[PDB]
Symmetry: D3
Amino acid sequence: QKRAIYPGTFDPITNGHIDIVTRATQMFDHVILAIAASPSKKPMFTLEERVALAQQATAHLGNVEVVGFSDLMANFARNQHATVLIRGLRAVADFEYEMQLAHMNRHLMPELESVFLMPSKEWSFISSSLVKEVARHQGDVTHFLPENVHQALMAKLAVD
Amino acid sequence: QKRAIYPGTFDPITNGHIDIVTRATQMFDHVILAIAASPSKKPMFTLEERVALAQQATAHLGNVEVVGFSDLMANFARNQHATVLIRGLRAVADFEYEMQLAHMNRHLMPELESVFLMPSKEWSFISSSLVKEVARHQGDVTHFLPENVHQALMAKLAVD
Amino acid sequence: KRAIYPGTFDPITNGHIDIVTRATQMFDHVILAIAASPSKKPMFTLEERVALAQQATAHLGNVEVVGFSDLMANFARNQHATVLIRGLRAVADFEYEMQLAHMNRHLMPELESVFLMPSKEWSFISSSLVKEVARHQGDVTHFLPENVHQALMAKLA
Amino acid sequence: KRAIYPGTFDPITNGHIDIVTRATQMFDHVILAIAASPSKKPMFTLEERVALAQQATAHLGNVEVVGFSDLMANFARNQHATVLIRGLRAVADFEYEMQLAHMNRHLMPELESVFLMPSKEWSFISSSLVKEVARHQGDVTHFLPENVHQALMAKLA
Amino acid sequence: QKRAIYPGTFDPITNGHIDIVTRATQMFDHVILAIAASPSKKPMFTLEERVALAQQATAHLGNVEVVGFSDLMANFARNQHATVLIRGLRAVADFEYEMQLAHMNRHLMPELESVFLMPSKEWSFISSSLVKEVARHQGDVTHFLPENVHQALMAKLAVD
Amino acid sequence: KRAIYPGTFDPITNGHIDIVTRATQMFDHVILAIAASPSKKPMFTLEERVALAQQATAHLGNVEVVGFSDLMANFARNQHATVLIRGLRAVADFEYEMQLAHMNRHLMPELESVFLMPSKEWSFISSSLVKEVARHQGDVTHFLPENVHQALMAKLA
Ligand SMILES: CC1=Nc2nc(N[C@H](CC#N)c3cccc(Cl)c3)nn2C(=O)C1
Ligand SMILES: CC1=Nc2nc(N[C@H](CC#N)c3cccc(Cl)c3)nn2C(=O)C1
Ligand SMILES: CC1=Nc2nc(N[C@H](CC#N)c3cccc(Cl)c3)nn2C(=O)C1
Ligand SMILES: CC1=Nc2nc(N[C@H](CC#N)c3cccc(Cl)c3)nn2C(=O)C1
Ligand SMILES: CC1=Nc2nc(N[C@H](CC#N)c3cccc(Cl)c3)nn2C(=O)C1
Ligand SMILES: CC1=Nc2nc(N[C@H](CC#N)c3cccc(Cl)c3)nn2C(=O)C1
């Protein structure tokens, strides 16, 4: 009965995040998609919007639970009885930062294992920040997002 | 009749940028040096100052046109009838970011080819941000800039 | 859940032991798979490498050590493994790791490549570096299981 | 404008076809230049590599396939090329690419090295990886032109 | 009689910084641990707090002088009669940035040599920014700091 | 203070001269240590490499050129060196450099590895690239001391 957490800002959730969480569900019994409540930089979408969007986009995956959190991801994993922390590794990931984070998470909770998954080649060169920057500048990002996220991002930028 | 765009903030234009745009003119019939009107971080020089400086520094290159833009660089390339997008690759470039940008630009305009040029070893370890940071801290940056840019940067920091 | 941990393991080091131990804490059964790897011209034969890894992992009840000369994705299919473990130390290896994982996915899409990070203690060593040091009579006891250390001493003697 | 696209092309892959196709859309004439490369001990002879690349690029009207054993900058001068094309997949290759481009510039300053990025589809493959998979009887049809796939099958048979 | 400067923000000084400065004292006759007075991002600790903390943490090292500075690190090295500039290289260091900085420092003061030291494996994956981010989020960072720094960081976060 | 600058120096280049010159401005005595390196199958014998480096560094009064086949940490101990110099050009080398430095520290904790950065002029060359260019009759005079250039010409003749 292995429980895994998949933390992030998911601002908004992309097809790359869907690809990662789907691979995680095929490996672990229970996956908690954990959304950061209060990131350093103010998010485009509120925590409620981000939770609602991730819930709709993962509804077809029976063993995914979407939950918000504001504490250390290691503390959150300990409270969720999770022994696995999922991180996606795109071709464009900051590997140096992943090593720092994993070694720090191990110092905080040694029994918590950081697991790196690789997304499809299709999502290996995108990020939520690149998608948003393109969208803010009127670029087509439909291909990178679930339908519900595309509709919400269009509505957000219409009134900005 | 190949048309190439060379986009950037050019805040201010450096000898590294001059080196890149010169190599581009030797390869393509028409080069548009495209200056970003409204970057995320407020620039040191206004768009008019940046355009005027780049115009003076490239005047000796007959097939360079200096133009400001505020849209997506792929949209700007499509409107300029350009099929080539020039990016300089210094030894200190963020290659991971270049891959993201190139793959995103290809998604937005598939017929637009991203072309990476390498500057002289002399300019392979500098950037406008490093030059400005050194200049703000009273360091000698004459070697890295065209004469007109050096005079304008001295005048800017005199009144800051 | 069955996971495979493939490699040349020429010889198996404390870094490899660290990885396979983390894998056993996550998956029900772990197959430590030793590739014949003749193109790399290994120091130890496949039988020596299998015997050494068996002795070094004996204390881990859910590890099975097996040799193979097959394509690793075919070997993973034949072992009924849906997880392929790879250890990650630094950025340089991460690139070849991406190629291998994308190729393994093309050959077997249901086989998931997972990357584990070793202890800081083993983050700067490799079988190649240990062998190079041992060839120049340097002390490598700290980096190897005891049985591997004695076999490497005997091999270079 | 004449551009040269040099390499070992042992064998030519879909990633190489992707690069040379992008080059033809930018330059009037493209020379796909196959280096003898004896130090790498190639799987296919230079004649086989030339024949394979010729058949695989026949549909591209402005590609000329030529073999060479010369210094690539001397070969580019002799082909009246002012552009040298190199494909870029990841960071690790980008370093050796910088050395090669700065050396080529020292030897021929008027020859410009340009870097093109392949499709995401071919961003994780290489001739070496394809050959390694094919040696272990793995399916590599997806990564190669048909004629190259059959020649690689015949070579390993 | 070689004099070396070891510059940084030291916000706060960590065991990684102590490891680096200790290695520097074993190599050079006089080491100046140089604390940046006015960094770009506002520091957690004031310059006086940072100086006091670094002084207490290096007191056992007889040939270390802790000094604040607000000018270019190359100008500061020239004024301190230092011909060596120490930079720590952790496994997670931004090497591209280190190359830019070293080449710029060499342009400003060619006789000033940039020297890269490697910390213990124990401190190879941490930074002051990661330690602070973990501490702000109630994580245990005792292991990464000198005792006096741990007490000061606890007091800082108690009133924040 | 005694510093050792070890390497294969096959042959010694202007980049190596740049590094050793910076080292002499920092330390009282510098030992340029040439590793036999038989596994790399060097172009020049150890005696040729020692003779060439001696002639190329003669103008630097505090450089001693010595050959060794020993573990570099044992050689540094025997030379009474507490500093080990390594030149740093780019990120790719920085990883192997970290492994080597952490291993050298394990073998000799009082021996400090220091990294120096060469001039921008030599930041894109290596002995391997210079030899490869010279093998194809390319001009490499700019990258080598005069005596090394003539010896490399004579070796390839
Ligand atoms: C070792 C570390 N553990 C950490 N846990 C958190 N948690 C917050 C929770 C909230 N809001 C967060 C903020 C932004 C993104 C994410 Cl994914 C998570 N931050 N954090 C670190 O920066 C370092
Ligand atoms: C795929 C992308 N395409 C893009 N085009 C732009 N255009 C703006 C125009 C203005 N002002 C800009 C801003 C700053 C620097 C530059 Cl060079 C260009 N941004 N942008 C992205 O961030 C991503
Ligand atoms: C996608 C790929 N599939 C592959 N299967 C194998 N199998 C051999 C078995 C033998 N000898 C092997 C050799 C070296 C290391 C390992 Cl772990 C496995 N190699 N191989 C690739 O290099 C790439
Ligand atoms: C600056 C340099 N100039 C050079 N010219 C050559 N030429 C040979 C021709 C043969 N065989 C070659 C070998 C392998 C790949 C290529 Cl693409 C070309 N190699 N070479 C360097 O390695 C560096
Ligand atoms: C070539 C460069 N030389 C430089 N010297 C300084 N000095 C300031 C002094 C203050 N306050 C400083 C600020 C933050 C951290 C440090 Cl370590 C030092 N900044 N700086 C550059 O950004 C680039
Ligand atoms: C931590 C290590 N210690 C080591 N000592 C040696 N010594 C040999 C001497 C000979 N031949 C050598 C070979 C090649 C380059 C150099 Cl610089 C030195 N190699 N070696 C390692 O590769 C790793």
